[PDB]
Amino acid sequence: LRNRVTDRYFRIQEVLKHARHFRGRKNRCYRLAVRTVIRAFVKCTKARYLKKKNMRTLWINRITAASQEHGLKYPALIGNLVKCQVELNRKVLADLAIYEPKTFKSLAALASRRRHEGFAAALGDGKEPEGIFSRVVQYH
Amino acid sequence: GRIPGRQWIGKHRRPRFVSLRAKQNMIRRLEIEAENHYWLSMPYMTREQERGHAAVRRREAFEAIKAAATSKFPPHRFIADQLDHLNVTKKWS
Amino acid sequence: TARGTPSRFLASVLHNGLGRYVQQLQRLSFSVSRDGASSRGAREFVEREVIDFARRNPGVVIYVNSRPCCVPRVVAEYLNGAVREESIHCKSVEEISTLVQKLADQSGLDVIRIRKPFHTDNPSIQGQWHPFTNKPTTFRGLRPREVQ
Amino acid sequence: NCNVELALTSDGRTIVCYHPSVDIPYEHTKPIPREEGPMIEQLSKMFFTTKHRWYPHGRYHRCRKNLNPPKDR
Amino acid sequence: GGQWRLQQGLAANPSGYGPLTELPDWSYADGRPAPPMKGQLRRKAERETFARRVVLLSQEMDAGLQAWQLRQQKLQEEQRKQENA
Amino acid sequence: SSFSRAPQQWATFARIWYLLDGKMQPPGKLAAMASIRLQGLHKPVYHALSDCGDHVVIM
Amino acid sequence: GYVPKTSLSSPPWPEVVLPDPVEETRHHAEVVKKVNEMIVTGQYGRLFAVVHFASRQWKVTSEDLILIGNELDLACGERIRLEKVLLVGADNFTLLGKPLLGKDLVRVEATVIEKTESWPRIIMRFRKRKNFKKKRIVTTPQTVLRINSIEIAPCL
Amino acid sequence: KFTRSRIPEKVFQASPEDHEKYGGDPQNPHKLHIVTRIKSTRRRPYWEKDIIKMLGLEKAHTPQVHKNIPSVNAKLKVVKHLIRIKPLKLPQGLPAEENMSNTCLKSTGELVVQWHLKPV
């Protein structure tokens, strides 16, 4: 047995240290543990995409809850903070909804105001003055 | 309520219907398509005027390709690599 | 994975940039072998950069020894008493100098998962939300179907 | 609810919102007034939950619970 | 909401060009400007190469037109001169 | 703001009772309002595991 | 033109009439004068600010921490003036910009505390029945900032 | 058999209703196209994958400037359902060497050679 592998304990414990919190003989026996630990690492690397996706639908749920509380909806709040060139993202808005609700009150009121201006400026088509908050900022 | 073979292959298939989503999506791709049809209609040079207007730039670009193919040859070999490797027995006295 | 690994919230050590910044690394212990091949690059660092490094940032005290029991090494000790021990086995001078600045650049806190990318301790100014922030009051505090 | 005073500064590159905190009026306020199975029914109906939340659980499950977890904020 | 952005001449994606990508994110408290961001260096260089190509193409187009006018005028000079003697 | 830790948390998470008259109404608009309020989807504190749902009394 | 009041004549959302621009600019002048006269006298408490740093916006209160997934090429402890402030709020007013508040109005300053690696992040690919199995470990660079000042100028 | 498709000539002869709607002038036609790819070439025949590589449009939603000559017109016409063609407008002059660093492409198709970002 001119040279046989002596360094094998350490392969097995590379793999078995990521399996100690498992259930059943997958926490202790190597063939079973190999399968499940590879399966664990694969789930980790697809769960990065699912973590970003989960975070954004949680933000949409919270902002919807706060703006449904202030009369608006989610589309009215977002698609009217767009039209004022207010570029907050969802994370900021959901944090504002929880921790600073007079500022969310201000945002929901501004969004509804700009909504009614963006219809009443669009209800009287033809030449008029434009609305107050329908005035854009050009960058040149 | 079963579809006989596989759902979307065969003689008998599960029916698929057109949402207003699908009609709107297809109609707006048609609008983009139509503007493309418009702008491909006013060509600047006529087909005789372009004959040769950039032969020089194509020939120089191909000479770059051609001389980029032939300038291929093994790398230079130096001494300092060899003796740089004598350094792997180096110490402090 | 992350379910397997410990996890900690984000922190400083002791309000580390509020009043003044404190260089959080105390010690380093290079242990470079005289006649040893694995410490080759480490020895070059000691002749080349470690005086410049020790003069660049004086908050650290630096010990250069000979003959470790296993592997040439840096022993970084921080002001929360943590020890990070890195092996500089078979490394060139570039990699060692980046690792030593890596050690200086950090705080003693572990390199386990940080649960949040942010840490506020006074999070809320206009008052945190409770179900009675925006709800309107009644008259005489009555509830629905309350007679008088 | 919303009672805020919204404005632009004159140039129109900011939006200033004025929102004071409105206190609750005094009139809108009241004066202060001065076995094991049947166990799980009584607790469930006290706390409005299903029975399953109060059934105990194994040593193995109680042995994965972290008892020095990180706090924050 | 990026159809409204396209109508107004803003970009559909506000993280494209705008103040929120092409201003610098930070500066020293003393007032010294930052090193330029490596994304912004990359994007300015993309913009460089694009404008270089537009200039090259425009020169090739109009040089082709002028060369065709020269071919026609020299042909007509030869037409008028071969109708002599 | 400026509550103590336990009362600020107690104010935030503790549950509310909502009456909801059901006369002449369809059972699905009642169900849609009541389902949103039973899950906790009317709170900006909403998390799936938070167990933040409220009480609904449909008469 | 006149329509009797039936079910579907006037749509169910409420009718609000936009005020004329003259008294509305009078109103805006009154509001801006109130808010600026608060700012000149310090009638506010502590401030928060939504700030568009590295690629994503943070809600930043003074005296706190922000972890940023890149190496910022700044020596440790070094002060920074976080430009691109895009909301600044207090207990009794806010100021949001379109999209950015001016640099002449809000100063937000931070420091760089620490410049770490992250934890090792495992990237495993696996395709089955195909002997396809790859593993990578990525340690990302991270820098932690501490935000010191949110100071507001009364230039409205 | 599905094959290549000759598009009839009459499709690319615009009417005056076009010239009112779009902003073109049939007299004095424009310099260059800005072409965007908006539709992947997967699930498309190999000749359209070839022409997308030849036009340099590989990355979706990336503008590419192409000459308004007939030859580029023919390559574009085969792949006109994958792309978007806008005229390259020049409001000012084309960028001289001085400002050719400090340029911009505007979404309306036009290239403005002075890149500011300040309030006006």
Side-chain angles (χ1 to χ4, degrees), chain C residues 139-140 142-148:
Chain C
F139 178 58
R140 195 162 51 280
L142 302 188
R143 45 184 172 269
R145 273 71 210 171
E146 191 76 25
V147 175
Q148 290 176 354

mmCIF file of all heavy atoms in Angstrom, chain C residues 139-140 142-148:
data_model
loop_
_atom_site.group_PDB
_atom_site.id
_atom_site.type_symbol
_atom_site.label_atom_id
_atom_site.label_comp_id
_atom_site.label_asym_id
_atom_site.label_seq_id
_atom_site.Cartn_x
_atom_site.Cartn_y
_atom_site.Cartn_z
ATOM 1 N N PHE C 139 -66.221 61.555 20.799
ATOM 2 C CA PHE C 139 -66.715 62.492 21.793
ATOM 3 C C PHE C 139 -66.963 61.772 23.105
ATOM 4 O O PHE C 139 -67.634 60.739 23.135
ATOM 5 C CB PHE C 139 -67.985 63.162 21.290
ATOM 6 C CG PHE C 139 -68.598 64.104 22.266
ATOM 7 C CD1 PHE C 139 -67.889 65.171 22.760
ATOM 8 C CD2 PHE C 139 -69.914 63.950 22.647
ATOM 9 C CE1 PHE C 139 -68.473 66.037 23.651
ATOM 10 C CE2 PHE C 139 -70.498 64.826 23.524
ATOM 11 C CZ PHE C 139 -69.775 65.862 24.036
ATOM 12 N N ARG C 140 -66.397 62.311 24.180
ATOM 13 C CA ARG C 140 -66.429 61.744 25.530
ATOM 14 C C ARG C 140 -65.841 60.322 25.548
ATOM 15 O O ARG C 140 -66.187 59.495 26.392
ATOM 16 C CB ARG C 140 -67.858 61.779 26.110
ATOM 17 C CG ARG C 140 -68.001 61.564 27.630
ATOM 18 C CD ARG C 140 -69.309 61.999 28.336
ATOM 19 N NE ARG C 140 -70.569 61.523 27.749
ATOM 20 C CZ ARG C 140 -71.197 62.043 26.700
ATOM 21 N NH1 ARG C 140 -70.746 63.145 26.137
ATOM 22 N NH2 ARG C 140 -72.328 61.501 26.266
ATOM 23 N N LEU C 142 -66.320 57.697 23.782
ATOM 24 C CA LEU C 142 -67.205 56.571 23.560
ATOM 25 C C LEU C 142 -66.648 55.642 22.495
ATOM 26 O O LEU C 142 -65.899 56.046 21.608
ATOM 27 C CB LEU C 142 -68.575 57.047 23.113
ATOM 28 C CG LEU C 142 -69.295 57.999 24.042
ATOM 29 C CD1 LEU C 142 -70.696 58.193 23.520
ATOM 30 C CD2 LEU C 142 -69.304 57.441 25.443
ATOM 31 N N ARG C 143 -67.044 54.387 22.583
ATOM 32 C CA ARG C 143 -66.754 53.354 21.610
ATOM 33 C C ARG C 143 -68.009 53.074 20.791
ATOM 34 O O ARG C 143 -69.065 53.653 21.056
ATOM 35 C CB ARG C 143 -66.251 52.100 22.333
ATOM 36 C CG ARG C 143 -67.023 51.708 23.541
ATOM 37 C CD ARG C 143 -66.347 50.538 24.178
ATOM 38 N NE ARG C 143 -66.922 50.202 25.466
ATOM 39 C CZ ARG C 143 -66.494 50.703 26.609
ATOM 40 N NH1 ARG C 143 -65.502 51.565 26.606
ATOM 41 N NH2 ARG C 143 -67.060 50.349 27.746
ATOM 42 N N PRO C 144 -67.919 52.267 19.734
ATOM 43 C CA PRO C 144 -69.128 51.939 18.971
ATOM 44 C C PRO C 144 -70.182 51.223 19.803
ATOM 45 O O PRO C 144 -69.856 50.422 20.678
ATOM 46 C CB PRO C 144 -68.594 51.041 17.853
ATOM 47 C CG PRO C 144 -67.189 50.747 18.214
ATOM 48 C CD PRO C 144 -66.739 51.941 18.927
ATOM 49 N N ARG C 145 -71.457 51.528 19.517
ATOM 50 C CA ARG C 145 -72.600 51.000 20.273
ATOM 51 C C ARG C 145 -72.538 51.320 21.761
ATOM 52 O O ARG C 145 -72.932 50.509 22.597
ATOM 53 C CB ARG C 145 -72.764 49.494 20.070
ATOM 54 C CG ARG C 145 -73.590 49.056 18.887
ATOM 55 C CD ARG C 145 -72.985 49.273 17.545
ATOM 56 N NE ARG C 145 -74.068 49.496 16.600
ATOM 57 C CZ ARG C 145 -73.896 49.896 15.356
ATOM 58 N NH1 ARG C 145 -72.693 50.121 14.917
ATOM 59 N NH2 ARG C 145 -74.925 50.069 14.554
ATOM 60 N N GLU C 146 -72.070 52.508 22.109
ATOM 61 C CA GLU C 146 -72.004 52.929 23.503
ATOM 62 C C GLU C 146 -73.030 54.031 23.715
ATOM 63 O O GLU C 146 -72.987 55.053 23.025
ATOM 64 C CB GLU C 146 -70.601 53.406 23.853
ATOM 65 C CG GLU C 146 -70.333 53.629 25.317
ATOM 66 C CD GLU C 146 -70.135 52.340 26.076
ATOM 67 O OE1 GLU C 146 -69.744 51.331 25.455
ATOM 68 O OE2 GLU C 146 -70.346 52.342 27.304
ATOM 69 N N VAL C 147 -73.929 53.835 24.682
ATOM 70 C CA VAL C 147 -75.190 54.575 24.692
ATOM 71 C C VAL C 147 -74.990 56.019 25.130
ATOM 72 O O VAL C 147 -75.275 56.951 24.371
ATOM 73 C CB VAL C 147 -76.225 53.859 25.578
ATOM 74 C CG1 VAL C 147 -77.489 54.683 25.679
ATOM 75 C CG2 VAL C 147 -76.548 52.504 25.008
ATOM 76 N N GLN C 148 -74.517 56.236 26.352
ATOM 77 C CA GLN C 148 -74.413 57.597 26.881
ATOM 78 C C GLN C 148 -73.113 58.262 26.464
ATOM 79 O O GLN C 148 -72.749 59.307 26.997
ATOM 80 C CB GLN C 148 -74.521 57.597 28.405
ATOM 81 C CG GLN C 148 -75.898 57.263 28.949
ATOM 82 C CD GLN C 148 -75.920 57.181 30.466
ATOM 83 O OE1 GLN C 148 -74.880 57.261 31.122
ATOM 84 N NE2 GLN C 148 -77.109 57.010 31.029
#
